[PDB]
């Protein structure tokens with residue numbers, strides 16, 4: 101089998117935001133990430149004053165010191181106000197990453213670390229302190245531990261006092277408006293038992309965003325942090341949706357337009373980044389790809405699923421493709437809405453996973469997804485660990501892009517056109533840096549479970565590429581190994597065999 105691949109370094113150049121190399125949980129530590137997020141269900145009820153938070157439906161609706169544990173804080177460090185967040189951001193500073201920090205909006209945060217909160221102990225109660233967005237009183241760097249309040253702008257002031265503003269090298273750059281609000285009543289019923297309203301969500305968002313922007317106008321505000329397509333569609337059947345939907349195609353549009361309107365009235369941009377989560381509903385062999393590695397058909401579906409992000413020709417097996425295919429592929433659809441209803445707003449996928457964490461199918465899916473995100477105008481993207489412990493093949497995909505040689509060498513910063521004759525069995529992504537005519541980066545993969553192909557590359561560039569080095573991973577080894585070089589290239593064409601279930605990063609030089 102031969103496939104032909106055409107790369108034109110002059111064509112479709114566009115910047116790849118480095119923050120697409122991003123994560124929630126830190127992985128092995130040698131992925132050379134550019135962005136880190138402190139978010140997810142635990143952050144909704146996180147109390148900065150004492151570092152306590154609540155698991156919600158994930159664990160017993162338990163209030164406890166988990167986030168201190170997770171961040172590696174000592175018992176003594178866990179007593180210091182803001183320590184989970186400052187320890188997190190100190191690590192970002194050390195690693196050179198963007199920090200995105202979630203702020204609370206569901207309305208209360210954990211008052212203690214005394215464990216499960218029963219139904220009748222729902223907020224307000226002794227187990228909860230109330231969130232107030234703007235203190236309207238002198239800020240304290242040592243907040244009042246004895247009252248019933250946590251003030252969000254006081255916390256932002258605390259961060260700015262320590263690190264400077266977002267516009268500075270050391271500042272915390274992004275803040276998120278809580279986490280998965282259409283799931284508050286399911287995940288955090290002890291905090292917000294009623295289903296969130298569409299108007300409610302906008303009002304809470306405008307109030308919190310104003311408070312933040314009053315402390316740091318340069319910080320980027322991310323919202324609405326939607327869990328998945330049911331929330332994109334109608335905010336999980338929000339009780340007021342029929343009353344507010346007017347002529348909107350989906351809640352995505354209502355939110356964008358209402359945030360744009362509120363920003364007008366306020367005289368400042370209140371939404372910087374439109375923030376979604378995306379866990380594929382794609383099925384294969386009777387199994388959702390995010391649930392477990394699955395069988396051969398689950399593995400095949402996992403590697404094809406990234407096409408739902410971009411490819412108009414691809415129809416996955418899911419309830420979304422079944423009943424809502426006019427909203428797919430998802431990235432161009434989201435971009436269409438953002439550009440129309442709040443021009444200039446960025447797009448982020450702040451929690452996602454394709455599953456198969458320790459399977460070559462998971463590695464290849466992610467090697468495709470990182471290429472796709474980079475060249476589809478996504479500002480920031482953060483993997484979420486659905487499986488605890490090592491996620492060897494996810495880490496492999498990041499390292500293939502960001503530390504392929506053990507020296508933190510990376511894919512280029514500029515996407516360029518790469519086309520393949522077979523979009524089912526292969527995917528391919530190309531890049532240069534600063535319009536280089538010296539070095540060209542190609543990430544290529546074979547998704548076939550059974551059949552190698554010979555990839556015949558045809559390159560267009562200003563100079564003649566003369567040789568290449570190759571690194572890769574496959575089903576036998578998740579570590580990125582050096583592969584046989586490309587020792588002779590003639591007239592900017594060369595052939596390289598890609599075995600089944602293999603991903604390579606090829607680096608061509610002029611020289």
Ligand SMILES: OC[C@H]1O[C@@H](O[C@H]2[C@H](O)[C@@H](O)[C@H](O[C@H]3[C@H](O)[C@@H](O)[C@H](O[C@H]4[C@H](O)[C@@H](O)[C@H](O[C@H]5[C@H](O)[C@@H](O)[C@H](O)O[C@@H]5CO)O[C@@H]4CO)O[C@@H]3CO)O[C@@H]2CO[C@H]2OC[C@@H](O)[C@H](O)[C@H]2O)[C@H](O)[C@@H](O)[C@@H]1O
Nearest residue numbers: 141157158280282283286287327328330336379381419423
């Ligand atoms: O870790 C991430 C995050 O996960 C959360 O869990 C969520 C699951 O991941 C997710 O799969 C689940 O999705 C379901 C949606 O909640 C649900 O609304 C959706 O309903 C679909 C039907 O599946 C579909 O058949 C139906 O089709 C209709 C069609 O609409 C109609 O036009 C036509 O005429 O008829 C068709 C056939 O009848 O359409 C509806 C939507 O319209 O199904 C999804 C798959 O099951 O959501 C999970 C969260 O849901 C929970 O919380 C909210 C409640 O509303 C749900 O009841 C509850 O189960 C974790 O919960 C979260 O903690 C975590 O962070």
Ligand SMILES: [Ca+2]
Nearest residue numbers: 244245249250
């Ligand atoms: Ca307090």
Ligand SMILES: [Cl-]
Nearest residue numbers: 280281282327
């Ligand atoms: Cl949501």
